[PDB]
């Protein structure tokens, strides 16, 4: 904090409390006692703890009737109207779509769709799987999960 490099008054005789600078944590314009600096809040999670968490979440999705498995899911042309109709035939509103590879046309759609997110098997984080109400995965993407998680 700028300034405050000299005593405001002498040590004794003035009748005031003892001070050594005006930029003290007790003073009005003084510095912070334990001021923050930029730092990284990153933790360590073992490879097998991260995988055992996915195996635990993916089982509940089956037990809670939230994992909907369909044989492939493709849409031609990028149009948000088109994807809305295809999502309506299954009666899905809040859905995460997980596939082996995110299509360019399927990524352009659902980019502006409100409660729909398109992901990849190696992209689907633990938070995303729990956040959405339904999870839509292709039969091909189901096979991929069986070789990354045992």
Q: Which residues make up the interface to RNA (CB under 7 A)?
A: 1-6, 12-19, 22, 25-30, 32-39, 44-52, 78-81, 84, 108-109, 111-115, 120, 122-123, 125, 131, 148
Residue 139 C-beta: closest distance to RNA, Å: 19
| Distance, CA of 83 to CA of 9 (rounded, Å) | 76
122 binds, among Mg ion, RNA, none (CB under 5 to 8 A by kind): RNA
- Smallest distance from RNA to CB 13, Å: 5
Contact 87, 134 (CB under 8 A): no
92 in Cβ contact with 110 (< 8 Å): no
Is the CB of 40 or the CB of 63 nearer to RNA?
40
Q: What x/- string results for residues 38 through 77 when contact with Mg ion is judged by CB under 5 A?
A: ----------------------------------------
Report the C-alpha gap between 127 and 146 in whole angstroms: 20
Residue 63 touches which of Mg ion, RNA, none (CB < 5 to 8 A by kind)? Answer: none
Q: How far is the CB of 63 from Mg ion (least distance, A)?
A: 27
If one counts every other C-beta atom within 10 angstroms of the C-beta of residue 145, the result is 17
Q: Is the dihedral of CA 104, 108, 109, 111 positive or negative?
A: positive
The CA–CA distances, whole Å, from 46 to 51, 53, 135, 145 equal 9, 11, 26, 19
Q: Does 30 bind Mg ion (CB under 5 A)?
A: yes
């Amino acid at each position: 904090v700028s300034g405050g490099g000299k005593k405001p008054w002498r040590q004794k005789g003035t009748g005031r409390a003892r001070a050594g600078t005006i930029r003290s944590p007790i003073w009005r314009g003084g510095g912070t006692t334990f001021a923050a600096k930029p730092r990284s809040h990153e933790q360590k999670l073992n490879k097998k703890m991260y995988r055992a968490a996915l195996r635990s979440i993916l089982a509940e999705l089956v037990r809670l009737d939230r994992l909907v498995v369909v044989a492939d899911f493709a849409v031609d042309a990028p149009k948000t109207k088109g994807l809305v109709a295809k999502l309506d035939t299954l009666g899905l509103k809040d859905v995460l779509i997980v596939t082996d590879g995110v299509d360019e046309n399927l990524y352009l759609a659902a980019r502006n769709l409100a409660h729909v997110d398109v992901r990849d098997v190696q992209g689907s984080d633990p938070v995303s799987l729990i956040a959405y109400d339904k999870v839509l995965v292709t039969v091909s993407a189901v096979k991929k999960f069986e070789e990354l998680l045992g």
